[PDB]
Symmetry: C2
Amino acid sequence: SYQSTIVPVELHSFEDAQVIGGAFRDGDAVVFDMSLLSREEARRIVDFAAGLCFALHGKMQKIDSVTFAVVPELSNI
Amino acid sequence: PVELHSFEDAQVIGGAFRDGDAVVFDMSLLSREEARRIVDFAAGLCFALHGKMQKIDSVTFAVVPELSNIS
């Protein structure tokens, strides 16, 4: 299946979750930074991302305190 | 109708919804924080599977899977 190299996303508010969701839903891995978000917002981003991962059997990884990644299930027929 | 007790129940909603079932959940027993975490998780769930979330009232929401239609 098609998938670009990992999509980077710099977050500024919870609404940006949509960018992560869009790319992840379309088969792309996404790494996003939460350096500029409040503690509350960061938490909302991760709960939304966990919802995305559970729904499509994706995997979420923590790179560091402000950097996380969601990776789609491997495409193998 | 799922009665939530903690954020850990997000999996109950998720499992059912992922299996193609509509889920209506009550958040009466949840803290303001937990309630919000549940809805954010559920929103990720719906976004991922092209589902729909509806607010029934302040403590009751529903996530509904995309309708199966083949042409």
